[PDB]
Amino acid sequence: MVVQHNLTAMNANRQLGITTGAQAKSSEKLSSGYKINRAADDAAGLTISEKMRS
Amino acid sequence: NISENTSSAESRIRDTDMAEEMVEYSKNNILAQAGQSMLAQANQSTQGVLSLLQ
Secondary structure, three states, rough: OOOOOOOHHHHHHHHHHHHHHHHHHHHHHHHHHHOOOOOOOOOOHHHHHHHHHH | OOHHHHHHHHHHHHHOOOHHHHHHHHHHHHHHHHHHHHHHHOOOEEEEEEHOOO
């Protein structure tokens, strides 16, 4: 089809990124042993966990 | 996502579909050979004068 932009491959690239992004946020939780490593993961859950750690 | 979809959109306006353009190229290539051959022919048509009570 078009030689000048492989769009089937640009989709597969963009979807490979969305997979390896999830894979790093999983791997983070396994290696640290903590589910909420950063405040993006649960703002209620970080805030409550700090009050309960306190 | 928006960058993939607008790359997809622009690629369709602007990139050669190489399968379509190789139809159009190949038609023209053969027509040129037929038109060269028909010009090589057309230069030889005036030869008929030379036998003509000359």
